[PDB]
Amino acid sequence: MKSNIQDNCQVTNPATGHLFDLNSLKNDSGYSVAYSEKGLIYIGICGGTKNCPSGVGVCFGLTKINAGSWNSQLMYVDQVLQLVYDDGAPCPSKNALKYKSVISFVCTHDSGANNKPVFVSLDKQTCTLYFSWHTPLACEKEEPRHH
């Protein structure tokens, strides 16, 4: 029961047993997420990118702020795959936590894509970069218990 937070960038759905994988989104090409103010935030998914440092999962482009350090901690929570890139750079903005990125992987009916990581919200309470990621892999073609 409950999400399988494994460090191999995968999560097995406790409802179906369908293992989820974001390793397919691992490219050094890197990702970007236009930030609301005047920059974007680069993303790497459980792997190294050239657009963000290896060891850095998510990093702002503006002033190069690691918004969440490298993690492969994948979960399946609220029908959404979620990576919590925590313990990033120090956040002196509002609260004194560190930057953390929560990329919420939202099912998209596409075929094995990432589409685009979208910046949905920022949390100034726990300096948490909320990302909306529409990925087909977060979608289950696998039928659940009550289908």
Side-chain angles (χ1 to χ4, degrees):
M1 301 177 299
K2 186 62 187 295
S3 182
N4 179 28
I5 317 176
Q6 199 183 91
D7 69 313
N8 293 276
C9 199
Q10 75 186 212
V11 50
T12 324
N13 182 19
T16 59
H18 176 72
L19 187 286
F20 289 105
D21 172 86
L22 297 173
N23 293 271
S24 307
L25 305 176
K26 299 196 300 181
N27 53 87
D28 73 281
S29 190
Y31 299 85
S32 45
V33 178
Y35 175 60
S36 41
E37 300 186 89
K38 59 290 186 61
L40 74 86
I41 311 169
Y42 308 108
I43 295 188
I45 296 298
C46 59
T49 156
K50 65 202 184 60
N51 92 330
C52 272
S54 194
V56 170
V58 167
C59 67
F60 284 75
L62 194 60
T63 58
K64 297 299 187 69
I65 312 164
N66 172 28
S69 301
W70 235 54
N71 290 91
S72 308
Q73 295 282 270
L74 181 61
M75 296 162 301
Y76 183 62
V77 47
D78 282 295
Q79 292 177 88
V80 164
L81 272 58
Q82 185 160 148
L83 290 174
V84 55
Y85 291 103
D86 176 50
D87 188 75
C91 176
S93 308
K94 293 297 178 180
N95 291 32
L97 291 80
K98 292 73 177 56
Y99 286 107
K100 152 175 73 295
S101 300
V102 277
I103 308 177
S104 310
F105 296 79
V106 166
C107 155
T108 191
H109 290 249
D110 292 76
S111 302
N114 72 268
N115 288 26
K116 191 196 307 177
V118 192
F119 187 67
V120 42
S121 296
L122 185 280
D123 185 285
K124 314 176 180 181
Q125 303 184 268
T126 172
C127 300
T128 307
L129 288 289
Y130 285 91
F131 298 111
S132 34
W133 191 295
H134 291 239
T135 187
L137 56 77
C139 211
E140 275 184 303
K141 294 177 293 292
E142 304 298 277
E143 299 296 85
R145 299 298 296 144
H146 302 267
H147 66 127

